[PDB]
Amino acid sequence: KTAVLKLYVAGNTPNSVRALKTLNNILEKEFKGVYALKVIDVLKNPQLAEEDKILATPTLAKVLPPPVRRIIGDLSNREKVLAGLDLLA
Amino acid sequence: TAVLKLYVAGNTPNSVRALKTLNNILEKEFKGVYALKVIDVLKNPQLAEEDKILATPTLAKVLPPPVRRIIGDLSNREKVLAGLDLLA
Amino acid sequence: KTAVLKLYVAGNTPNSVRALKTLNNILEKEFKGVYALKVIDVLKNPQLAEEDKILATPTLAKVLPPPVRRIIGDLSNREKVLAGLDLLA
Amino acid sequence: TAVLKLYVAGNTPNSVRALKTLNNILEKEFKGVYALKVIDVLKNPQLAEEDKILATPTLAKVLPPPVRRIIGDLSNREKVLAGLDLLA
Amino acid sequence: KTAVLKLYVAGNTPNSVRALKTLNNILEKEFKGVYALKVIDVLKNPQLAEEDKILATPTLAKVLPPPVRRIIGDLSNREKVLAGLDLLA
Amino acid sequence: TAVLKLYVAGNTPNSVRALKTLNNILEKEFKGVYALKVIDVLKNPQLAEEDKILATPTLAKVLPPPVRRIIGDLSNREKVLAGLDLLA
Amino acid sequence: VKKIPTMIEGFDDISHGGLPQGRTTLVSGTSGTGKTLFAVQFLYNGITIFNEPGIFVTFEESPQDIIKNALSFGWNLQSLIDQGKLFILDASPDPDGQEVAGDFDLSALIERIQYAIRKYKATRVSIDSVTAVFQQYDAASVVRREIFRLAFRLKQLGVTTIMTTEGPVARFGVEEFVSDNVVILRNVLEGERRRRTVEILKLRGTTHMKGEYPFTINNGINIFPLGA
Amino acid sequence: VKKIPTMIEGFDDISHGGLPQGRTTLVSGTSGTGKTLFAVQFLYNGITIFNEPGIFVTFEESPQDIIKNALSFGWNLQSLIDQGKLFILDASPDPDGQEVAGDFDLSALIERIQYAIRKYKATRVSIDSVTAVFQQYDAASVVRREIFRLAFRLKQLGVTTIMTTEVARFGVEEFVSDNVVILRNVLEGERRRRTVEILKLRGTTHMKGEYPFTINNGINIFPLGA
Ligand SMILES: Nc1ncnc2c1ncn2[C@@H]1O[C@H](COP(=O)(O)OP(=O)(O)O)[C@@H](O)[C@H]1O
Ligand SMILES: Nc1ncnc2c1ncn2[C@@H]1O[C@H](COP(=O)(O)OP(=O)(O)O)[C@@H](O)[C@H]1O
């Protein structure tokens, strides 16, 4: 319940809208609404990226509800994100 | 007196992979091979130590024969569905 | 004619009932009856394994009719056993 | 004010692979993303040098965002059809 | 227009009638008639192979119309020859 | 005057693989390319030595052109069914 | 800056006050140079002198054989272990070996360690042979990560910890970099004799002795270099 | 043309005027030879003498543990960070580790760096152990590209920068750079001598060879004058 996931992107770099395109359909074709999103253009508001001290783009997800975790990359490989989706049990 | 016991790490991804695929085994293959036990070793690990486990998620079985224990994600469905069995 | 094949197993170790399960269906789905079998639980009658001086489990087959040969393993790989089946010609 | 620009080496095989697959992209996906420019750098390379290119076939794009340039045969249809895009 | 392609073969070595068999159907199934052919049995008229200074068999194609290029081998791999076909554009 | 000759090692598995796949070639592709000869080199190897063979199963051909000899299981159906041919 | 005593016969004065505290100490040497022994003697000094309770984690060895090991130098542990001495976490391999149906996160082990600690009041823990863990599980990817999460957890808990791992002088970092202060025990062979020596490359953010110095063993490891 | 002082005890004269300016200088040695020290102390030298603010990027080390490091030398950095002078950038790996589902554009780190600099106006930057990302990320492909765009971006900003990397060898896939110091720890006989070798500064006056050194409050070196 109240599931959360948040994403770090680099403006509109190719790898990362690869990532976003492939992602939004994952997040609302499997299940229409687990949870909405936040996208972070680290190119023009990076201090949020720095206070979260994230290091890479595109860096995906959120660590609440438990545990603290979460995954980076192209996100073309649907298997690993649908292997890293949590909840249900 | 059917028995089957499973060890998990809270809700790490590997272990909900494990749990999903396991219960789905348990209700696609055979409904009741053996009852179950799931352990969040984070707040009762002394049970994990009496079980002398080292890794998660660790899935194990005692009787019927043999005494056995296999670990992992339980992603490799082939070998684990090959690691079910009984007959005797 | 009078084809023979004999098998060495380790009780009910996983690899070896993998082996036996996969095997019996091979031996009586391809051809219902070339020949029946003998299974050897080397765990509680190993001196037969020692007089035949076999070394590994699961160790499969028989070397008569000619030639002296024969094959070990998981026996999941059906290709190699149906490549090592002899007879017919 | 749509723009898209392409660099080729006369008629080397790699570059007619490139051109075929490119125009076919341009008339299977979207008819008019951006107009085109093709350059046989063999008899007007000063254009290639103002473009500071090093390799052929080099396919590039300036506006709409971002300023970008990708090279090659354009055989890997997946990454280049992933390297189209816009939205903004 | 007036497209040209010429081939060097080694008599009737296996690799090279592999090559020719696989080739003729390529050259007249895709398109019936871009252009006819010349085959060179370098085993009994090799000085033509020497004045063209070719080095390997089976060595395929022609370098006019532009550019000077062209490809050798088994020619089983249809992809590379249909990637190296030129013309149309 | 069709001719084709084959060398086998008694009934080693590789060679009944070879024989099965060969005869099946000979009666799926072309019924009669060339007559046959099979040799259990164990009790007439002087024939193998006049043939100067080193390996089994060795499959060979003399006329029509060229004089040729290929070895093995004859499992790789692609290359051997590519190593048939004639035309001239 | 922090520091903790050991009183191994003549080692401490080189470290000018012993090991770092709340930090992970890695000890590496070629097989047969008494790394495990160093861990044992370390922690036994701890519990006997400071009553600094201990955890001895073993992958390679079996407990019964580690006690029969240590009993050689005149230390009787299990009867005294009944006092609430040191606790030996058994991480010896299941002889039947194990099969894999997916990848593992070694949470079981680390959490087991920390319950063991929070039960035994322990401030000191040694860990014998991580390379064995790399040769236990044939996945060289994760064990790096989870050994790292172990060592980091120990740094959080502030406990003193030791790691033992397996050509001496030349390219020697074994296979497990991942640590924060390093002792390298090498025994060199020259001519036709053997010199057991300790090198401390450096102890990070702390006084350390300059260079390598030979040692031998008695009831506990000894050497005393520096005079004056 | 141009060069910038370090004012670390006895290094500056080996480089015939200290580190280069507007260019990224790589500092490499085998593990356990005080490269990190050279970097930290570099930025501390910059900030204490020149009030030239610094950005210290750290993967291997832990920030609080770098300060508990520095308190050995008797220097309070946290007071210096609150002074608004030096910033220790935490790029240490999350102990929880990483999972991977695709390729990376490592823009996040670099943008973090340049925000940090353009906020602190910093003219000095250390980068401790780029090698750590290699011990983090198993892709030796892209890190090439992103290290190059990092060092280049820093040269746009014109700040002096240092990179640390992990006996007498090369650079273990660290890629060539435009000026390089290799400080080597030697093992001879049955004792060990720390020496600094400075390999190249391109287009600049330079000293010849390897030179022995030891440590105090700051690194000490033995030149040759008179
Ligand atoms: N009484 C003794 N005298 C000399 N050496 C001993 C004695 N008892 C044990 N040892 C030494 O202790 C060492 C055990 O340490 P080592 O061989 O490195 O095993 P590990 O790698 O498990 O530490 C042995 O090499 C052995 O030589
Ligand atoms: N008391 C001290 N004496 C000498 N050096 C010290 C002292 N305290 C801290 N240091 C320095 O802190 C540094 C931390 O850097 P380190 O990570 O060891 O560099 P490297 O990457 O070469 O291992 C040490 O190398 C050491 O030189």
Side-chain angles (χ1 to χ4, degrees), chain G residues 71-86 88:
Chain G
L71 187 50
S72 185
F73 294 173
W75 296 327
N76 166 11
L77 271 70
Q78 198 211 354
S79 172
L80 179 62
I81 291 170
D82 309 315
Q83 289 251 124
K85 251 192 148 287
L86 59 95
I88 298 181

PDB file of all heavy atoms in Angstrom, chain G residues 71-88, unseen atoms left out:
ATOM      1  N   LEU G  71      44.256 -25.883  20.791  1.00  0.00           N
ATOM      2  CA  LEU G  71      44.613 -26.631  21.996  1.00  0.00           C
ATOM      3  C   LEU G  71      46.081 -27.083  21.982  1.00  0.00           C
ATOM      4  O   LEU G  71      46.600 -27.570  22.986  1.00  0.00           O
ATOM      5  CB  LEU G  71      43.680 -27.838  22.157  1.00  0.00           C
ATOM      6  CG  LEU G  71      43.739 -28.681  23.433  1.00  0.00           C
ATOM      7  CD1 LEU G  71      43.672 -27.789  24.654  1.00  0.00           C
ATOM      8  CD2 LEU G  71      42.612 -29.703  23.459  1.00  0.00           C
ATOM      9  N   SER G  72      46.740 -26.916  20.839  1.00  0.00           N
ATOM     10  CA  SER G  72      48.150 -27.272  20.686  1.00  0.00           C
ATOM     11  C   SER G  72      49.074 -26.377  21.510  1.00  0.00           C
ATOM     12  O   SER G  72      50.102 -26.825  22.023  1.00  0.00           O
ATOM     13  CB  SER G  72      48.542 -27.197  19.207  1.00  0.00           C
ATOM     14  OG  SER G  72      49.864 -27.653  18.990  1.00  0.00           O
ATOM     15  N   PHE G  73      48.697 -25.110  21.629  1.00  0.00           N
ATOM     16  CA  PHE G  73      49.505 -24.114  22.325  1.00  0.00           C
ATOM     17  C   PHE G  73      49.139 -23.993  23.802  1.00  0.00           C
ATOM     18  O   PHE G  73      49.647 -23.118  24.505  1.00  0.00           O
ATOM     19  CB  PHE G  73      49.404 -22.763  21.615  1.00  0.00           C
ATOM     20  CG  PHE G  73      50.019 -22.764  20.244  1.00  0.00           C
ATOM     21  CD1 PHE G  73      49.894 -21.669  19.405  1.00  0.00           C
ATOM     22  CD2 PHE G  73      50.731 -23.870  19.798  1.00  0.00           C
ATOM     23  CE1 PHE G  73      50.465 -21.682  18.147  1.00  0.00           C
ATOM     24  CE2 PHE G  73      51.301 -23.888  18.549  1.00  0.00           C
ATOM     25  CZ  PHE G  73      51.163 -22.796  17.717  1.00  0.00           C
ATOM     26  N   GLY G  74      48.248 -24.869  24.259  1.00  0.00           N
ATOM     27  CA  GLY G  74      47.805 -24.861  25.640  1.00  0.00           C
ATOM     28  C   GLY G  74      46.660 -23.925  25.961  1.00  0.00           C
ATOM     29  O   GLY G  74      46.658 -23.269  27.004  1.00  0.00           O
ATOM     30  N   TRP G  75      45.688 -23.851  25.056  1.00  0.00           N
ATOM     31  CA  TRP G  75      44.495 -23.058  25.302  1.00  0.00           C
ATOM     32  C   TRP G  75      43.266 -23.968  25.221  1.00  0.00           C
ATOM     33  O   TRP G  75      42.993 -24.564  24.177  1.00  0.00           O
ATOM     34  CB  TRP G  75      44.399 -21.924  24.278  1.00  0.00           C
ATOM     35  CG  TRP G  75      45.523 -20.922  24.364  1.00  0.00           C
ATOM     36  CD1 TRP G  75      46.194 -20.530  25.488  1.00  0.00           C
ATOM     37  CD2 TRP G  75      46.124 -20.215  23.273  1.00  0.00           C
ATOM     38  NE1 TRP G  75      47.163 -19.608  25.163  1.00  0.00           N
ATOM     39  CE2 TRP G  75      47.142 -19.399  23.802  1.00  0.00           C
ATOM     40  CE3 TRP G  75      45.897 -20.186  21.891  1.00  0.00           C
ATOM     41  CZ2 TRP G  75      47.930 -18.565  23.009  1.00  0.00           C
ATOM     42  CZ3 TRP G  75      46.680 -19.357  21.102  1.00  0.00           C
ATOM     43  CH2 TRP G  75      47.682 -18.561  21.662  1.00  0.00           C
ATOM     44  N   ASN G  76      42.522 -24.068  26.320  1.00  0.00           N
ATOM     45  CA  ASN G  76      41.344 -24.934  26.374  1.00  0.00           C
ATOM     46  C   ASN G  76      40.120 -24.036  26.285  1.00  0.00           C
ATOM     47  O   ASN G  76      39.891 -23.211  27.170  1.00  0.00           O
ATOM     48  CB  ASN G  76      41.335 -25.783  27.654  1.00  0.00           C
ATOM     49  CG  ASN G  76      39.980 -26.443  27.939  1.00  0.00           C
ATOM     50  OD1 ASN G  76      39.076 -26.462  27.102  1.00  0.00           O
ATOM     51  ND2 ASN G  76      39.848 -27.000  29.139  1.00  0.00           N
ATOM     52  N   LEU G  77      39.343 -24.174  25.216  1.00  0.00           N
ATOM     53  CA  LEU G  77      38.329 -23.166  24.950  1.00  0.00           C
ATOM     54  C   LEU G  77      36.884 -23.546  25.275  1.00  0.00           C
ATOM     55  O   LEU G  77      36.219 -22.802  25.989  1.00  0.00           O
ATOM     56  CB  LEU G  77      38.411 -22.752  23.474  1.00  0.00           C
ATOM     57  CG  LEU G  77      39.350 -21.593  23.117  1.00  0.00           C
ATOM     58  CD1 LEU G  77      40.810 -22.005  23.266  1.00  0.00           C
ATOM     59  CD2 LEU G  77      39.090 -21.090  21.706  1.00  0.00           C
ATOM     60  N   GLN G  78      36.416 -24.710  24.823  1.00  0.00           N
ATOM     61  CA  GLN G  78      34.981 -25.021  24.921  1.00  0.00           C
ATOM     62  C   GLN G  78      34.443 -25.085  26.351  1.00  0.00           C
ATOM     63  O   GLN G  78      33.327 -24.618  26.630  1.00  0.00           O
ATOM     64  CB  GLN G  78      34.658 -26.334  24.205  1.00  0.00           C
ATOM     65  CG  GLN G  78      33.169 -26.479  23.887  1.00  0.00           C
ATOM     66  CD  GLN G  78      32.686 -27.915  23.893  1.00  0.00           C
ATOM     67  OE1 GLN G  78      33.473 -28.850  24.033  1.00  0.00           O
ATOM     68  NE2 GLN G  78      31.378 -28.098  23.745  1.00  0.00           N
ATOM     69  N   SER G  79      35.245 -25.625  27.259  1.00  0.00           N
ATOM     70  CA  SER G  79      34.856 -25.649  28.658  1.00  0.00           C
ATOM     71  C   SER G  79      34.806 -24.226  29.192  1.00  0.00           C
ATOM     72  O   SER G  79      33.887 -23.863  29.929  1.00  0.00           O
ATOM     73  CB  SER G  79      35.832 -26.499  29.476  1.00  0.00           C
ATOM     74  OG  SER G  79      35.575 -26.397  30.867  1.00  0.00           O
ATOM     75  N   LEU G  80      35.798 -23.428  28.811  1.00  0.00           N
ATOM     76  CA  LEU G  80      35.822 -22.018  29.166  1.00  0.00           C
ATOM     77  C   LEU G  80      34.791 -21.256  28.296  1.00  0.00           C
ATOM     78  O   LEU G  80      34.271 -20.227  28.718  1.00  0.00           O
ATOM     79  CB  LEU G  80      37.253 -21.466  29.060  1.00  0.00           C
ATOM     80  CG  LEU G  80      37.564 -19.998  29.359  1.00  0.00           C
ATOM     81  CD1 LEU G  80      37.207 -19.760  30.807  1.00  0.00           C
ATOM     82  CD2 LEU G  80      39.061 -19.676  29.148  1.00  0.00           C
ATOM     83  N   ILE G  81      34.484 -21.775  27.100  1.00  0.00           N
ATOM     84  CA  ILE G  81      33.466 -21.158  26.236  1.00  0.00           C
ATOM     85  C   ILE G  81      32.128 -21.215  26.957  1.00  0.00           C
ATOM     86  O   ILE G  81      31.285 -20.335  26.780  1.00  0.00           O
ATOM     87  CB  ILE G  81      33.331 -21.814  24.811  1.00  0.00           C
ATOM     88  CG1 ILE G  81      34.558 -21.546  23.939  1.00  0.00           C
ATOM     89  CG2 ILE G  81      32.268 -21.116  24.007  1.00  0.00           C
ATOM     90  CD1 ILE G  81      34.589 -22.350  22.641  1.00  0.00           C
ATOM     91  N   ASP G  82      31.925 -22.245  27.772  1.00  0.00           N
ATOM     92  CA  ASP G  82      30.718 -22.292  28.595  1.00  0.00           C
ATOM     93  C   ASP G  82      30.569 -21.045  29.506  1.00  0.00           C
ATOM     94  O   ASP G  82      29.457 -20.749  29.978  1.00  0.00           O
ATOM     95  CB  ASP G  82      30.707 -23.563  29.449  1.00  0.00           C
ATOM     96  CG  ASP G  82      30.965 -24.831  28.639  1.00  0.00           C
ATOM     97  OD1 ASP G  82      30.370 -24.989  27.555  1.00  0.00           O
ATOM     98  OD2 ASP G  82      31.741 -25.691  29.110  1.00  0.00           O
ATOM     99  N   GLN G  83      31.677 -20.326  29.738  1.00  0.00           N
ATOM    100  CA  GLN G  83      31.652 -19.086  30.534  1.00  0.00           C
ATOM    101  C   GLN G  83      30.958 -17.945  29.815  1.00  0.00           C
ATOM    102  O   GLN G  83      30.546 -16.946  30.424  1.00  0.00           O
ATOM    103  CB  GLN G  83      33.030 -18.529  30.827  1.00  0.00           C
ATOM    104  CG  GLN G  83      33.944 -19.194  31.763  1.00  0.00           C
ATOM    105  CD  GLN G  83      34.172 -18.441  33.104  1.00  0.00           C
ATOM    106  OE1 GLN G  83      33.929 -19.051  34.169  1.00  0.00           O
ATOM    107  NE2 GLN G  83      34.435 -17.099  33.066  1.00  0.00           N
ATOM    108  N   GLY G  84      30.745 -18.158  28.528  1.00  0.00           N
ATOM    109  CA  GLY G  84      30.267 -17.112  27.667  1.00  0.00           C
ATOM    110  C   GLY G  84      31.443 -16.441  26.972  1.00  0.00           C
ATOM    111  O   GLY G  84      31.360 -15.267  26.645  1.00  0.00           O
ATOM    112  N   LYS G  85      32.555 -17.171  26.835  1.00  0.00           N
ATOM    113  CA  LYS G  85      33.761 -16.785  26.070  1.00  0.00           C
ATOM    114  C   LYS G  85      33.539 -16.186  24.677  1.00  0.00           C
ATOM    115  O   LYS G  85      32.908 -15.144  24.495  1.00  0.00           O
ATOM    116  CB  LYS G  85      34.624 -18.037  25.875  1.00  0.00           C
ATOM    117  CG  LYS G  85      35.946 -18.195  26.610  1.00  0.00           C
ATOM    118  CD  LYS G  85      36.658 -19.391  25.954  1.00  0.00           C
ATOM    119  CE  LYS G  85      38.170 -19.330  25.930  1.00  0.00           C
ATOM    120  NZ  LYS G  85      38.739 -18.359  24.980  1.00  0.00           N
ATOM    121  N   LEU G  86      34.131 -16.874  23.702  1.00  0.00           N
ATOM    122  CA  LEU G  86      34.057 -16.535  22.287  1.00  0.00           C
ATOM    123  C   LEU G  86      33.046 -17.472  21.630  1.00  0.00           C
ATOM    124  O   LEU G  86      32.873 -18.608  22.073  1.00  0.00           O
ATOM    125  CB  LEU G  86      35.434 -16.628  21.615  1.00  0.00           C
ATOM    126  CG  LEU G  86      36.171 -17.968  21.637  1.00  0.00           C
ATOM    127  CD1 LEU G  86      35.924 -18.761  20.368  1.00  0.00           C
ATOM    128  CD2 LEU G  86      37.655 -17.735  21.839  1.00  0.00           C
ATOM    129  N   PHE G  87      32.380 -17.010  20.577  1.00  0.00           N
ATOM    130  CA  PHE G  87      31.431 -17.863  19.871  1.00  0.00           C
ATOM    131  C   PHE G  87      31.897 -18.136  18.452  1.00  0.00           C
ATOM    132  O   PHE G  87      32.137 -17.219  17.669  1.00  0.00           O
ATOM    133  CB  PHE G  87      30.043 -17.219  19.847  1.00  0.00           C
ATOM    134  N   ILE G  88      32.010 -19.419  18.128  1.00  0.00           N
ATOM    135  CA  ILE G  88      32.431 -19.840  16.801  1.00  0.00           C
ATOM    136  C   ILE G  88      31.244 -20.043  15.869  1.00  0.00           C
ATOM    137  O   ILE G  88      30.512 -21.033  15.973  1.00  0.00           O
ATOM    138  CB  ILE G  88      33.257 -21.140  16.858  1.00  0.00           C
ATOM    139  CG1 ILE G  88      34.537 -20.919  17.666  1.00  0.00           C
ATOM    140  CG2 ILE G  88      33.598 -21.622  15.455  1.00  0.00           C
ATOM    141  CD1 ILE G  88      35.416 -22.140  17.754  1.00  0.00           C
TER     142      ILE G  88
END
